């Protein structure tokens, strides 16, 4: 942003309606290859936020004081705001519509009726071509001027309304009345709604008028049969409305289907380790397949209706023409080339305007909704700030028998408040929860209303909230909080709040960016930073509501003594606390009880009085390459599918072309040399009604229309099927590769990225790519068919076209290097805007207490203008490209007309009419082509990401090992032996298993206990072969697991995870998703784990719905279900991993004894750290950073003082005994 005056201000009418200043910017962008924020121009003074906000606020205030705030119309105010510019836009749009109608109708009618004449006049035909050229130029440039006015009007409206919304938001009493996302959307998206509304509705009020003009003109030309063409549009456009409604209806159900699929995919990715060690890959694969097929069916329906409503404008023209001319000629009327093709051209113009209109209606509807939301915002109750000064300056806060009430209506919580605070008196607030302390704080701040009495106040406020709002900036910026910098005072403040450890831990503490709520900081550090901000702010009154609650007692007391009893001895401090041991040194103590003042005074007086304050006192003491397109085509079915789809596209467009050509051919035939009686003499009469074969031509015309409709339906169905097949192939291959990659992938890659590939990359391909691809291919084939028709009539049209192809290529290059670099600048400047919005809305109370409601508004305005400049340039660049492509189209039509008039007598009038109709049809198709090409390129970037992941993922071990099945009874016993065990999770990482060797006899209860990182967590990983060994071997009963298949290895081992893993579905699904056991076995397992009574009591005992993670049972019930699932397998060796996590005592004993008795005959590998639980087992194994030092019975280890296990047992006993 750098300018003196914006180039739009120094632009004449020609530059405004051709956008030559943006041509200069486009030249700069193309030469550089990219744009920076310094290459764009700053907002004009006219579109600045402040002046427009002032205008809008004045207009709203006049409405409020004329009608009142219960019958006020913000729509009226927005109208009056935009009125003059909207009127100018409507005038220019009327000019555009008049020119667009006058060109085809009058110009083509006279041009074609000149070709039907017998004598050639060269000074009249050229005048007709000149008129056509001038009319096309006028309509193009008037539409450009309309868009230019609308863009500035919308930008001004957006800026003004967003600034007004933030102004209101910064002074809201009930901050939590509206939501936080709602308040964000008020300042973020509603402005875009208003901008789009302004521009596109200003377009709206020009659409139906040219349709009426065309209907009247068709009636004038033909007779009562023009109403036939008129009624086609009337019946047709509501049909496309209904198609849109149906597509939306089906896409609403597709949302639920996709949500279910993504939820299951999240379950698969989050607990992939559990699925691998349980060999449960197939069940989740089948469930995802079922959800995917139902989603695919819904997608098929939605895509069918979408394709139904894609490319109907030539279809409208052809249907209207067929009905009109068939019923015209079957009733015995007469028709010529001029009349028929003038009517066709008028149909084309009507379709153009009606293509414009519907989205305008939609935009105005969304505008009405947004204006309703804005009016709801602007009428909310505002927060005040008490200004009634006290009598004596010595008093800073003073009330008098006041009774204040909350607002939710008045909710009374304060009664007869007699409060007087003198300067320098540190006051403390005491009481119970809800006594009215925060109510007092809010009343002093200015959020409450007065009923009786008076409130006095003097001075400025600092504020440390209980949540410690942290500003989204650097740690030094949010300690100044808009204040000037000083070295010694800042250092003293930092030393006062104990920030030096914080300065040491953070990498660039004094310059570290902090999140809106706190990303790498703790609650105590947040409190310390808020306190530092308060002390630096240096105000007269301090409101510290529970500033040291989350803080530790030691550091809390340290800060209290070092700052509150030292720094603020000369200022007023409002200390609100729940820890009442701090008020022994306070100057004055205040106790609140049920909103009524009962006892206060000095600490010794409170001790002497033995009041309720004493009772609580004693209690506390106790761009993509061709490769991506080739990959997508191969996924769709290969070259054959592409050829079939292209063939059907060409068949549809050529059916429309054949309908038009058949009209031309039927007109060209004439009467076919028939002599008829017209009186006393007979002679040849050239009239299409005298053709003996006229009914044949009419029948073929109707057949052409029907065949075009059938081909459109077939094309839609086949395209939807092929695109969804491609997307399904991509999804299936990606899922297959995901379910078969080692845990190294899931460890080095966040699950968020993989879900993103599944969640939004799949959604993007599925819905978006077929839609944009269909629109692009339809438009390109239509352009090719129009050019081919005009060329089959005139090859020198191709001669002229060539250079225009070069110009189109140049335009596409320049308008693609510019529009893409303005799109990025638009959203780069939006990130600070949204961050500021969120940070401000999350800290409104602190902003209001600090009286910083204008600095944040100024920053909001600055960020809004920074965002608004590139967005304005972006829209104007859209219209710049549109103007130049319109120039190319105008050149095409002018060339066609010149050829029509230079070949008078050599071309039949019907073929000339056909050519001119297609030349006019060529209008407006180039901008759509360019924009759709860019959109499909983006969708294929998404496909590029998906295929990158598809061809990137590595391979796990094969499901079956060639070394063959070990045995049909393996393991026969539970003897496991280790020797020279080497294991490492990844490459270059230190080994976690360093020459570990031990033997375990069957039925032994072995409790693995050790320090963190000793390798306790790798026994299960190496036993299940999740990570291959780097040395040594693992042997069970003389069988080396290195030569047994993964399925045959994991099928005979069971593991109880540290946390309970429960998937969405039913209990039957979470207990035996393969349906391999009988009901009796399941119920015996359930009664073994004490679960039969809890399950049979449910109405759907074995079919009961299980929520995500099983948040419908208690923790004990979830653990019982997990042990039941493990027990259902009947495995000889099991790994139980530290199943203690915040559990009640008797439940812990019950689960411990249940595991003791259930697995009595199975070898137990208990991975736990609680030493007291492992006592009584057979042998105790202790690992020392990947090696075992002591391994024997606990009896011989606790009897030896030198034993390390005895040492840690003694340490644990001391930790339990000493609290202290």
């Amino acid at each position: 942003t750098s300018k003196h005056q914006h180039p739009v201000d120094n632009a004449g009418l020609f530059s405004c309606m051709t956008f030559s200043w943006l041509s200069s910017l486009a030249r700069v962008a193309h030469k550089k290859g990219e744009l920076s924020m310094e290459d764009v121009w700053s907002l004009s003074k006219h579109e600045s936020s402040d002046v427009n906000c002032r205008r809008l606020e004045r207009l709203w205030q006049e409405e409020l004081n004329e009608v009142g705030p219960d019958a006020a119309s913000l729509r009226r105010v927005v109208w009056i705001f935009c009125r003059t510019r909207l009127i100018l836009s409507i005038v220019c749009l009327m000019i555009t519509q008049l020119a667009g109608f006058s060109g085809p109708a009058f110009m083509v009618k006279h041009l074609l009726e000149y070709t039907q004449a017998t004598e050639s006049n060269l000074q009249y035909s050229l005048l007709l071509v000149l008129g056509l050229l001038l009319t096309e130029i006028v309509r193009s440039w008037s539409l450009a001027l309309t868009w230019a006015l609308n863009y500035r009007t919308g930008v001004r409206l957006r800026g003004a309304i967003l600034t007004m919304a933030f102004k209101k938001i910064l002074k809201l009493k009930n901050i939590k009345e509206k939501s936080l996302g709602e308040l964000i959307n008020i300042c973020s998206n509603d402005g875009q709604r208003m901008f789009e509304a302004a521009a596109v509705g200003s377009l709206l009020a020009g659409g139906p008028v040219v349709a009426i003009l065309g209907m009247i003109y068709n009636v004038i030309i033909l007779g009562p049969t023009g109403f036939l063409g008129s009624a086609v549009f009337i019946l047709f456009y509501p049909a496309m409305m209904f198609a849109s409604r149906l597509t939306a209806y089906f896409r609403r159900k597709c949302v639920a289907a996709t949500d279910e699929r993504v939820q299951k995919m999240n379950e698969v990715l989050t607990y992939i380790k559990f699925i691998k060690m349980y060999a449960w890959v197939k069940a989740f694969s089948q469930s995802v397949q079922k959800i995917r097929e139902e989603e695919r069916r819904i997608l098929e329906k939605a895509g069918y209706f979408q394709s139904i409503t894609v490319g109907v404008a030539p279809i409208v023209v052809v249907i209207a023409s067929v009905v009109t001319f068939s019923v015209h000629m079957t009733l015995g009327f007469d028709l010529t080339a001029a009349q028929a093709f003038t009517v066709v051209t008028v149909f084309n113009s009507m379709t153009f305007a009606l293509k414009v209109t519907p989205f305008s209606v939609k935009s105005l509807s969304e505008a009405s909704v947004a204006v309703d939301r804005f009016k709801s915002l602007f009428l909310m109750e505002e927060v005040h700030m008490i200004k009634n000064k006290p009598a004596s300056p010595h008093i800073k806060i003073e009330m008098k028998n006041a009774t204040l009430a909350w607002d939710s209506r008045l909710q009374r919580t304060l009664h007869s408040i007699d409060l007087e605070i003198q300067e320098g008196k540190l006051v403390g607030i005491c009481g119970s929860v809800g006594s009215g302390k925060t109510s007092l704080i809010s009343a002093i701040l200015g959020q409450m209303t007065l009923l009786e009495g008076s409130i006095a106040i003097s001075g400025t406020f600092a504020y440390v909230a209980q949540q410690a709002w942290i500003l989204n900036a650097t740690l030094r910026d949010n300690i100044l909080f808009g204040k000037e910098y000083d070295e010694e005072r800042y250092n003293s403040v930092l030393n006062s709040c104990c920030l030096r450890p914080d300065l040491a831990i953070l990498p660039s503490s004094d310059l570290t960016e902090i999140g809106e709520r706190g990303a790498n900081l703790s609650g105590g550090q947040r409190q310390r930073i808020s306190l530092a901000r308060a002390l630096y702010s240096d105000r007269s009154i301090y409101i510290l509501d529970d500033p040291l609650s989350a803080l530790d007692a030691h550091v809390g007391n340290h800060i209290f003594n070092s700052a509150i009893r030292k720094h603020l001895k000369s200022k007023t401090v409002l200390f609100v606390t729940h820890q009442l041991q701090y008020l022994v040194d306070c100057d004055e103590v205040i106790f609140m009880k049920e909103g009524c003042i009962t006892e206060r005074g000095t600490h010794e007086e409170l001790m002497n009085l033995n009041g309720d304050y004493a009772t609580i006192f004693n209690n506390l003491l106790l761009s993509v390459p061709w490769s991506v397109y080739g990959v997508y085509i191969q996924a769709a079915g290969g070259p054959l599918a592409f050829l079939v789809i292209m063939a059907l596209f060409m068949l549809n467009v050529g059916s429309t072309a054949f309908s038009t050509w058949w009209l031309s051919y039927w007109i060209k035939q004439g009467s076919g040399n028939t002599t008829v009686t017209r009186g006393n003499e007979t002679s040849v009469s050239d009239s299409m009604k005298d053709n003996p074969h006229m009914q044949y031509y009419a029948s073929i015309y109707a057949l052409s229309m029907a065949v075009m409709l059938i081909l459109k339906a077939i094309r839609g169905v086949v395209f939807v099927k092929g695109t969804l097949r491609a997307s399904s192939r991509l999804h299936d291959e990606l899922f297959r590769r995901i379910l078969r990659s080692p845990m190294k992938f899931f460890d080095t890659t966040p699950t968020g990225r993989i879900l993103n590939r599944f969640s939004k990359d799949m959604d993007e391909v599925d819905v978006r790519l077929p839609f944009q691809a269909e629109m692009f291919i339809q438009n390109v084939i239509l352009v090719f068919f129009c050019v081919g028709m005009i060329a089959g009539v005139f090859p020198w049209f191709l001669v002229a076209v060539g250079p225009l192809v070069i110009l189109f290529s140049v335009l596409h290059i320049v308008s693609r290097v510019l529009i893409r670099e303005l799109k990025r600048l638009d959203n780069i400047t939006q990130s600070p805007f949204l961050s500021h919005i969120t940070s401000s809305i999350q800290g409104l109370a602190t902003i209001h207490a600090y009286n910083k409601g204008q600095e944040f508004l100024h920053r909001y305005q600055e960020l809004l203008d920074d965002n608004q400049a590139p967005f304005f340039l972006f829209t104007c660049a859209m219209r710049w490209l549109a103007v130049r492509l319109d120039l190319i189209s105008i050149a095409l039509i002018t060339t066609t007309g010149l050829m029509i008039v230079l070949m008078h007598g050599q071309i039949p009038p019907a073929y000339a009419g056909l050519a001119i109709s297609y030349a006019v049809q060529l209008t407006g198709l180039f901008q759509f082509t360019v924009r759709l090409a860019s959109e499909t390129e983006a969708r294929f970037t998404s496909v590029e990401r998906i295929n990158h992941y598809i061809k990137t993922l590595s391979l796990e071990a094969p499901a079956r090992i060639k070394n063959k099945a070990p045995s049909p009874d393996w393991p026969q016993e539970g003897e496991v032996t280790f020797e020279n065990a080497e294991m490492r999770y990844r490459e270059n990482l230190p080994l976690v298993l360093k020459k570990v060797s031990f033997t375990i006899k069957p039925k032994e209860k072995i409790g693995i206990v050790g320090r963190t990182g000793s390798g306790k967590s790798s026994l299960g990983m190496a036993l299940f072969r999740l990570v291959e060994l780097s040395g040594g071997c693992i042997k069970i009963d003389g069988v080396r697991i290195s030569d047994i298949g993964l399925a045959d290895l994991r099928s005979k081992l069971s593991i109880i995870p540290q946390e309970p893993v429960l998937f969405s579905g039913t209990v039957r699904s979470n207990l035996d998703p393969f349906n391999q056991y009988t009901e009796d076995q399941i119920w015996d397992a359930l009664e073994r784990t004490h679960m039969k009574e809890c399950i049979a009591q449910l109405p759907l005992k074995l079919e009961s719905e299980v929520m995500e993670n099983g948040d419908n049972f208690s923790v004990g019930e979830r653990q019982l279900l997990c042990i039941a699932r493990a027990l259902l397998r009947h495995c000889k060796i099991l790994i139980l991993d530290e199943a203690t996590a915040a559990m009640d005592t008797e439940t812990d004993l019950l689960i411990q004894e249940t595991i003791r008795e259930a697995f009595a005959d199975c070898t137990m590998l208990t991975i736990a750290h609680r030493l007291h639980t492992v006592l009584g087992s057979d042998r105790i194994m202790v690992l020392a950073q990947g090696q075992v030092v002591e391994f024997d019975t606990p009896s011989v280890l606790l009897s030896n003082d030198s034993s390390r296990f005895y040492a840690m047992f003694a340490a644990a006993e001391n930790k339990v005994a000493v609290k202290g």
Partner: peptide, 19 residues
């Protein structure tokens, strides 16, 4: 969602994203 009639009029000079 996104229609082919809304897109045709919105690809005339507006951005192709409703949200």
């Amino acid at each position: 969602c996104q229609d082919a009639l809304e897109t045709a009029a919105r690809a005339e000079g507006l951005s192709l994203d409703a949200s």
